[PDB]
C-alpha cells in the first residue's frame, strides 16, 4: 500500500482549495497520519466550499487578508497538541507574512510561490522592478537574514519552482557520470555551483510542453489553462525575468538589472507571457516557450553561483522559464494580449474534461560538451488518473512536490527558511517519483541557431549558439 | 432557380484543382451555359484526378511549368469554337506568363494571386525586395504598359485580393452618406481617390477573423488551414508588406521602400505571418492580426492615390492585411515558427470536418470623423453548405469572387489587364452577394491606443491613434 511517511501532531491548515489544493489534500490524507478533524481548509470560494463539503473536510469560507490573517491563523495553527503545518496553496495572500506568522508560532510552512497581498500588482505606484519575482524573493532572503534558523518554512516548493531544482541536481550528476567523471556527488552549495562551472553549463531552461487538451474546443472570450488562470495571468503580466549567466555577452535595450540583492537576475520591460524564446523538449523538439517569470529562474542561478575572494560572481548560469502551455492556453494568451484585456471568464481543465496529453516538464542544461541535456517528467493524464484523484497531470506534478517538501520539513523541522535548492534532492525525489510518470534524460544536438540565418537578416552570435541573443525572439 | 449569366462557347481551362478549384467548378457549371466536355482541369495530383473523374470532367495530370506551359496550354486555350476562358487557381505557376499566353491567344484569364514559377519563393540569391508582392505586381503593371488594352485578364480576383476592393468602394459610399460629404458617386479612379481623401480615410485594414473549427483537434506536427497551406506558408514567409499612407509619421528601422514602381508600398525585413498588428472586427472585437502580404495592400493604396500636377502623391491610404486565421492555423503558425521549419504534414479543413464558425472578412476604414468603419461578409459554414457544394466558408468567398470576375470579363472582354479595383464593383457584388451571407457595416470607437499606455513603457504616438507606430506589435 502507499507509504505513510510521518505523523503530523497538530493542525493542518490548508489555505486555498483551487486546482493545487484539491490535488494536494488527497496526498496529505494518503501519506500522513493524523486525526482527520485536525485538517481545515480556508478558501473564500463557494465552488471550493461545496467540494470540501463533499470530501468531508472542515472548511472555513473566508479570504485571508492583511487585516484578518493574525486573528484567523494564529489560533488555528496553535490548536495543538504539537506542531502544526500551514499548507499555503492560495492566490492573493502574502507568502512572506503568513510564513513569518507560522514560524513565530512554531508551525511548519510550505508554499509554491512568493505571492503578495491582494492589490500588489494592479497598483500604478509600482515600478516594473518592484513587480519582479527577484524583488519578491529578496523579501524572503531578508526575512531569513533577520531570523536565521528556527522552524522550517519551505518557499516555492511546487513543480516549478520546486521539483525542477531537484532535477537540476540530478541532471548535473548525470552529465558528470556520462562524461566518465566519477567520485562523490557534491554535498555543499559551493560544490554544486562548482560542478556546474566545471562541466561548462552555460545556462538552464525550465523547458516545459503541456499537451493536455479538452473534449470541448477553446471557447471565445474564455481563458483556459491547466492550473490557476488568475495566477498564470498575473505572472504573465509581470516582467519577463531571468537568472543572468556570466557567459552572456548581450542583453536587450529594455533589459534592466538590480541595485541590490543576490545579484543573479535581470528583467525585461515587457510582459513575460508575451515574450517568446527558442527552446526544446523531447516531445516538442524545437518550440517557442514564453519567458514567464518564476522564482527558480533566480534561485537556481543564485544557488549555482561561484564567487571569487572579493565576492564578485565569476560563474553563474543563465536560468529561465521556456513555457509552452497547453494549446488552449496558447490561444488564450493570443486572445488576451490581442484584445488588450482579460477575458470575461476563465476555466481550469478538470481531469474529467481532458481527452489526452502530458505535462512534459524538465530542465534543459546547455553549453557543456554534449550541447544540451533535458531531464524531467513526462507524466500523462492517463497515468495521473490511475495514481491520484482530483487533478490533472499539471496538478499532480505540483501536489506531489508539495508532498515531498512536507515530508522533508517534517524530517528536518529546525532548518529555518529554505528554498527547494536547499533541500535533500534525493529524499525529495524519492517521495515524489511515484507521481511523476516517466522521468528521463535526453541529449540533443539542437541549438537556437538551427536553420539560421534564414531569409532575413538577424542579429545572431554564431560563435556561441546558446547566447540569449540567439534565444530571445526579436 | 440560379441565374445563368452567359453562355461560354470556347474551352474552359482550369489550372489547379485544390480547395478553390473544387469550390469554383460547381459555380461555373451552375451559372454559365456550355457543354461540359469543353471544360478541362489540369493538376499534377492524384487526389485532384480522382475528384475530377468523379465529376465526369476532362482531366490532364500535369504540373504546368516554365518548360511546358506553352506547348501544354496553347492547344487547350485555342481549341474553339469560341473564345476560351483560363481559370487559374493553382500554386507554383507564373500568373504573369500564363496570363500573357492567354492574351496572346485571345483567351480570357482570371486568377486570385500573382504567383511566380516554382523555385522563386526560396531562391537564396533573391533580395527581400524582389520577394515582395509589390515587385510581383510591378511585373503585371509593366505588362499592361507594354500591351495596353486587348483581351481581358483579371489579376487577383479572389476574396482578398479581389472582393475586398469592391467592399472598399461600398464602404467609401456609405461613409460619404454618414459623414454628409456631398457629390456624385465616383466613376473614375481619380474620383474614388479624391473621395477617400475628402473623407479623411487615413488607412484601411483588410480585417479578417476566421472562426471555423474542426471535429478533431489540431494534430501535432500538422499545419491546418481553411485554404491552401502551401500558399499560406509561402506568403507568410514573404516579407510583411503594406500600402503606405501619406499620414504615417514613423516606420520601423527594418522597413524598406522601393526605388521604382507605383510608389505605394513598404515592406519589413521579417516574415509577415510572424508579424502581429492590432486590429478589430465585429465578432472578434480587438484582436491581433498577422501582417501577411497581399496584392490588395498595394493595389488599393495605389488605386486611392491622389497626385498633384507634378505627379507626386499628396494623399494615399495605408492599407494592409490584419489576418486572424482559424484557431488551428494560429497554432500552426506558433508551431512552425517555433520549430524553425515547416511541419511534416498539412491539411485543409473540409466542410465535412468543420463543426461551426464563420469567415468574417471585411475592410476597416479608419481615421475619418467616425473613427473606424468595418464593412464585409460574415459568412457561416452552415450557410455555405446550404448554398454551394464542395467548399467551406473561406472557399466560397473566393470562388464566388472568381465567378463575379468571370461574369464581368465576359461582359467586358476587351478591357486588357485589370485588377479587382478596375472592375465595376456593383455588377461584381450583384453576382457575388448571394454567396456572402450577412454583409454589414459597423462603426466602432476602438483604436490601437485602447488601454495604452499600460504596465510598461511603450513607443507610441499619442497624437494620432491610427499611426502604424501604434498598430504594429513591437
Ligand atoms: N510552483 C508551481 O509549480 C506552481 C504550480 C501551480 C500553481 N502555483 C501557484 O499555487 C497557487 C495555487 O494555484 P491553483 O492552480 O490552485 O490556483 P487556483 O486559481 O485554482 O486557486 C486559487 C485558490 O485561492 C483562492 N483564494 C483567493 N483568494 C484567497 C484568500 N484571500 N485566501 C485564501 N484563499 C484564496 C481561490 O478562491 C482559489 O480557490 C497559485 O498561487 C500559484 O501561482 C505554483
Ligand atoms: N485571393 C484570395 O482570396 C485567395 C484565397 C485562397 C487562395 N488563393 C490562392 O488560390 C490558389 C489556390 O488556392 P487553394 O486553396 O485552392 O490551394 P491548394 O493548395 O488547395 O491547391 C493548389 C492546387 O495547385 C496544384 N498545383 C501545384 N502545382 C501545380 C502546377 N505546376 N500546375 C498546376 N497545378 C498545380 C495542387 O496540386 C493543387 O491541387 C493559391 O495560389 C492561392 O494562394 C487566393
Ligand atoms: N513557474 C510559473 N511561472 N508558474 C507555475 C507553472 C506550473 C506549470 N508546470
Ligand atoms: N540557496 C541559496 N541561494 N543559499 C543557501 C541558503 C541556505 C539556507 N539555510
Ligand atoms: N491575402 C492573402 N495573403 N491570402 C488569401 C487569404 C484568403 C482568406 N480569406
Ligand atoms: N488600378 C490602378 N492603380 N490604375 C488604373 C488601371 C486601369 C487599367 N485599365
Numbering used by the authors:
A (entry chain A), B (entry chain B): 3 to 476
Relevant lines from the article:
In contrast to its eukaryotic counterparts, bacterial HSS synthesizes 1 mol HSP from 2 mol PUT. NAD+ serves as a non-covalently bound prosthetic group for BvHSS. The interface area of the dimer was calculated as approximately 1700 Å2 by PDBsum indicating a stable dimer23. The BvHSS subunit consists of two domains as determined by CATH24: one “NAD(P)-binding Rossmann-like” domain (domain 1, residues 3–163 and 394–425) and one “homospermidine-synthase-like domain” (domain 2, residues 164–395 and 426–477) as shown in Fig. 2a and S1. The crystal structures of BvHSS containing NAD+ clearly show that the active site is localized inside each subunit.
